[PDB]
Design an enzyme around this catalytic site. Structure first.
Site, mmCIF file in Angstrom:
data_model
loop_
_atom_site.group_PDB
_atom_site.id
_atom_site.type_symbol
_atom_site.label_atom_id
_atom_site.label_comp_id
_atom_site.label_asym_id
_atom_site.label_seq_id
_atom_site.Cartn_x
_atom_site.Cartn_y
_atom_site.Cartn_z
ATOM 1 C CB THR A 197 44.501 104.269 43.505
ATOM 2 O OG1 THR A 197 43.865 104.314 44.795
ATOM 3 C CG2 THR A 197 43.926 105.342 42.580
ATOM 4 C CG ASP A 198 42.838 100.315 47.414
ATOM 5 O OD1 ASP A 198 43.539 101.261 47.853
ATOM 6 O OD2 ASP A 198 41.719 100.019 47.892
ATOM 7 C CB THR B 47 38.432 105.919 44.172
ATOM 8 O OG1 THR B 47 38.687 105.066 45.298
ATOM 9 C CG2 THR B 47 38.014 107.309 44.672
ATOM 10 C CE1 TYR C 58 75.673 96.997 56.598
ATOM 11 C CE2 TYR C 58 74.226 97.099 54.695
ATOM 12 C CZ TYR C 58 74.913 97.732 55.707
ATOM 13 O OH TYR C 58 74.836 99.103 55.830
ATOM 14 C CE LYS D 285 46.354 104.269 47.070
ATOM 15 N NZ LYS D 285 44.989 103.648 47.103
#
Ligand SMILES: CC1=N[C@H](C(=O)O)CCN1
Ligand SMILES: CC1=N[C@H](C(=O)O)CCN1
Lengths: 327, 327
Positions: free
Chosen positions: B84-85, B12, B274, B155
């Site tokens: 950024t993806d 971007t 658990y 992210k």
């Protein structure tokens, strides 16, 4: 005055440290006693399930939805105690299955067993009781002094008290001292109380990762999966370099719904924004907008209980049914 | 004085709003000019890729790792601009492929194109430049005034400036005015700078949902997938009621690694806690501890470039290699 019903589903809140670690054991009435709650004179108790919420199946949603519907006229509010692991899936699905309830239906639980001295159970039960007697109708989740819309709620932390957040959507109410203060009331249309148990649970959720090919998708179709959700990166999209994935999507998206959500926690997807997004749209991908991951999955299952027509499924997925989505 | 190299991968930050929405176009040198940076007298520039990071493939990691290694002696710091993806996947994988670098290697990018007036690009590039000349060696990500360890970064937001967070791990440095203030320095052992490009990218990530059966898992194995990561609920575990999933896992976990991480954002997994967790352990599931989802996926790919022996893979996945995991 006000009459409320408490329905037990199990969860850490009702759990004990047995042989193989924590497992659900206590009844919802016992949970209330141990948590030290007394302001419950006119409280009815029902144990529907008693399990670690990791064990919850779609049929349990059917059983719970039916039970809620049979009881919305008899009570002023209903509280459901539930494990945190799948709490958001259950609160999301019940929001679709049981529309326009005339009373508050409040899901809650705890990260720390009610038996334990430092338990978040008393606070969460208190908040749930205060909201269940508020007269504010709808399906909600009470946790860590917050009340959130059930269909906008996700678990964001595995080992913290503040385990749940309202995702891309305002808090309904919050504790200030003992004052449960309203922050935002959802804008319901109040139609007729509607039970709709129809759903198809056979859906697959795949995380997008670099290099992913379409092979597992066509395998899913051959396996009879009726829908696929993909968590893309960021605002959403499909890579066209490196794999047969986009080409695979173009072929499958008219046989079954392929829904795009995001791997990130907040802000959702917008496929119109990037070239990879618009190509995904052209390939037939359905955007999940700002829906939580749990609302996206349960909404798709629910819709698949009504239609297999991809075009119609696209229309319904893009339509704000119960507050889960910004229209 | 200090000499730094800037490597462009696209993103971007370098994008323009073309025909089908944003796509990467500008060179890394142009990005610096448009963002208004001048304090870069001795800065070398290299364009390695120019793509929306949704397009990044594992081979690009190989190309970038090689390029970094060829340049760690020549420069005092290296900055990589990146979409950024998949930024976190790339910063995670490079952390495994390029161990003990002698200099800071800083990944950055922006949520808003550098062309745009309100762009976060200038701040992020400034932070990256300040850190690349700090002398603090390792692989890092600079974003929104923060410097985070590359292998602990995810992210979390798709449409906000504060897009990245350090997950379960302290911030390395943060801006106070123009003062980049150190918060925490990772405890490296400084061995010999090691390039290790070996990886197998054929892994599948499946989100656990109520009702999931093991059928898609054995399909993956038949498809030749070499590893599966499952995002369980909360602290982790496998449902034994309702599906053949646990039984399916017990059979497959000795043929291929099956890794359990969480769908939640913070705090990671702990399967000892658990009954559903301990059963998952008994079934042969490998816990991802407190690793980010990106570190878990890239670490598994990397290890599969070294061994297919499940026992050994388990040992390596549980071992803290570069700060990605609490040992
Ligand atoms: C089963 C059902 N009948 C009534 C109705 O649909 O109007 C009440 C809600 N759902
Ligand atoms: C290829 C390589 N050889 C040297 C070594 O392994 O010691 C430098 C880092 N990696």
């Amino acid at each position: 005055m006000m009459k409320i019903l408490l329905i037990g589903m199990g969860g850490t809140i009702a759990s004990v440290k047995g042989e193989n670690g924590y497992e659900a054991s206590l009844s919802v009435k016992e949970v209330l006693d141990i948590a030290g709650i007394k302001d419950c004179e006119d409280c009815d108790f029902l144990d529907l399930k008693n399990v670690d919420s990791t064990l919850i199946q779609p049929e349990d949603w059917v059983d719970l939805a039916e039970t809620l519907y049979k009881n919305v006229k008899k009570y002023d509010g209903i509280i459901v105690t539930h494990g945190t692991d799948t709490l958001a899936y259950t609160s999301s699905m019940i929001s679709f299955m049981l529309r326009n309830p005339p009373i508050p239906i409040v899901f809650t639980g705890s990260m720390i067993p009610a038996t334990e001295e430092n338990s978040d159970a008393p606070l969460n039960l208190q908040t749930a009781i205060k909201f269940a007697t508020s007269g504010i109708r709808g399906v909600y989740v009470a946790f860590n002094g917050k009340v959130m819309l059930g269909v906008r709620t996700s678990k964001v932390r595995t080992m913290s008290r503040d385990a749940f957040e309202s995702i891309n959507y305002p808090i309904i109410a919050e504790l200030r001292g003992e004052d449960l203060v309203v922050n935002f009331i959802p804008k319901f249309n109040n139609g007729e109380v509607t039970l709709d148990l129809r759903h198809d649970p056979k859906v697959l959720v795949i995380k997008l990762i670099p290099g992913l090919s379409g092979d597992i998708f066509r395998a899913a179709v051959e396996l009879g999966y009726r829908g696929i959700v993909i968590e893309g990166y960021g605002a959403g999209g499909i890579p066209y370099r490196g794999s047969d994935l986009l080409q695979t999507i173009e072929e499958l998206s008219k046989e079954i719904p392929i829904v795009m959500t995001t791997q990130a926690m907040y802000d959702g997807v917008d496929l119109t924004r990037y070239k990879v997004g618009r190509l995904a749209l052209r390939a037939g991908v359905i955007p999940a907008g700002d829906m939580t991951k749990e609302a996206t999955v349960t909404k798709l299952m629910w819709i698949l209980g009504h239609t297999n027509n991809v075009e119609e499924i696209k229309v319904l997925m893009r339509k704000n049914l119960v507050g889960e989505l910004r229209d």
